[PDB]
Design a protein around this ligand. Structure first.
Ligand SMILES: Nc1ncnc2c1ncn2[C@@H]1O[C@H](COP(=O)(O)OP(=O)(O)O)[C@@H](O)[C@H]1O
Ligand SMILES: Oc1ccc(Sc2ccc(O)cc2)cc1
Ligand SMILES: [Cl-]
Ligand SMILES: [Cl-]
Ligand SMILES: [Cl-]
Ligand SMILES: [Mg+2]
Ligand SMILES: [Mg+2]
Length: 268
């Protein structure tokens, strides 16, 4: 097995940025293989103390094999940087698509939820929890199919949290923002937040401040605009339960009558 280095690649257009990741299109020189190179700075990793998160991201994602999960092929590093070799997703993020269209119709939404649930069913069969499902981490393949990415926060259940929360609370369940013990049911809550955001255009507990967002999440304070149908309301309300053990199994999501009636892809 290679043995990769920076000299092996021709770098191209920037694909996106994250808090740590700087991601570029790249072509491997001998084979002409097109891929995405996710670049991290060692100094930023060390100052933040998140080395263990990157190791998890690599070890966990590299061993997963599912059509709705982005491949990680390998990694390498030099004096200043770490490089992750990823599958290239040519149709961009679900985030960008939502910005373009404002809201998704029921068919598009049900289809994405099916693909998401299929992917998560596979992860949970290995007791892997993702913990950071949100539109900017959902990528699209050449056929428009959804692929879960960014495994930097992923772990094995059950878990406590040992690392500071930096960004948005918007997709996290009450047991996570309250810093309590949690399990695979965290991803089911996030799936409910996504289904609402796809249909409405914004997440259900969104607010102007951290402090009030925290309040809306812990008290589960959400309401529906008139256009959200009865079937969508039933599914979203089952997923957004304060008590995690009352959230449904992923098989129950995949077989929900609103999902089966509107999705264009089958359950796996
Ligand atoms: N494999 C890929 N193909 C296409 N675009 C990507 C790929 N990976 C990341 N991106 C873009 O780069 C952004 C940041 O990547 P991500 O892995 O989520 O980094 P971070 O860990 O910093 O959030 C994504 O939200 C997306 O816009
Ligand atoms: O500070 C750093 C720098 C590079 C890495 S790469 C890596 C290391 C071990 C491992 O088991 C998997 C991937 C991780 C942390
Ligand atoms: Cl694009
Ligand atoms: Cl987070
Ligand atoms: Cl509840
Ligand atoms: Mg990300
Ligand atoms: Mg990350």
């Amino acid at each position: 097995k290679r043995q990769w280095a920076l000299e092996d690649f021709e770098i191209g257009r920037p694909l996106g940025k994250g808090k740590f990741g700087n991601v570029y299109l790249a072509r491997e020189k001998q084979s002409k293989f097109i891929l995405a190179l996710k670049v991290l700075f060692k100094a930023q990793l060390e100052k933040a103390g998140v080395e263990h998160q990157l190791r998890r991201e690599v070890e966990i994602q590299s061993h997963l094999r599912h059509p709705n999960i982005l491949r990680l092929y390998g990694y390498f590093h030099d004096a200043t940087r770490v490089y992750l070799i990823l599958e290239y997703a040519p149709l961009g993020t679900v985030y960008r698509e939502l910005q373009k269209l404002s809201k998704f119709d029921e068919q598009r939404t049900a289809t994405y939820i099916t693909e998401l649930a299929n992917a998560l069913s596979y992860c949970h069969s290995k007791r892997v929890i993702h913990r950071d499902i949100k539109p900017e981490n959902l990528l699209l393949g050449s056929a428009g199919e959804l692929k879960i990415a960014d495994f930097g926060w992923s772990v094995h259940a059950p878990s406590s949290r040992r690392t500071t929360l930096a960004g948005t609370l918007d997709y996290l369940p009450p047991e996570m923002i309250e810093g309590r013990m949690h399990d695979e049911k965290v991803d089911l809550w996030s799936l409910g937040v996504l289904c609402y955001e796809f249909l409405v255009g914004k997440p259900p507990f969104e607010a102007n401040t951290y402090q009030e967002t925290y309040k809306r999440i812990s008290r589960v304070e959400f309401t529906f605009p008139d256009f959200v149908t009865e079937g969508a309301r039933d599914l979203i309300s089952r997923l957004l339960k304060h008590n995690p053990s009352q959230r449904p199994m992923l098989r129950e999501v995949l077989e929900h009558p609103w999902i089966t009636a509107n999705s264009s892809k089958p359950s796996n």
